[PDB]
Amino acid sequence: DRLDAALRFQQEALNLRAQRQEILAANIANADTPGYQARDIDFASELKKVMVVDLLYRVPDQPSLDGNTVDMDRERTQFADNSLKYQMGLTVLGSQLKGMMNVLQG
Amino acid sequence: ALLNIFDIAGSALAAQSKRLNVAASNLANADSVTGPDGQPYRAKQVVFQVDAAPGQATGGVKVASV
């Protein structure tokens, strides 16, 4: 359907933002697990792949003794950024749907 | 990836965390006689550099090495 092609990009971006949000929150929740590696996804490459998931390990900053590589500050900033981008995607998708609607209303 | 302000402030947070970690490790090893092997502990320092960035005018902080 042509309607899907117009809204495909924003829907895929929104779904990818939700998945990465879940991954970041999993990183936050498992901060205290000894031996847990902080995992993340490269948003742009996966968005290419879906439009046309694989988890990448985060490069550790400080060496802990229990093997936990989760850094609070980095993932807190990433979490806030992902929340903001999810809201922006919701706004853009809603604007596109509302425009398609006011075209029809009459 | 990150918005520019997010990246700058998050880099600042990470750099301050690294400096605090270095200070804490130094304060812990204030009375150490021998290290992993047999050599004395040497006080660590962290050097702040400004992320050059394409903009240059705006840039966060990175830490080259301890």
């Binding site: 990448l56 985060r58 490069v59 229990d66 850094d71 | 830490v63």
Partner: peptide, 21 residues
Amino acid sequence: GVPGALSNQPAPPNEAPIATP
């Protein structure tokens, strides 16, 4: 390379021995 980048390889285990092996 830079702390906070993305790599396809897990970091090596963080061992800290008390004596030289």
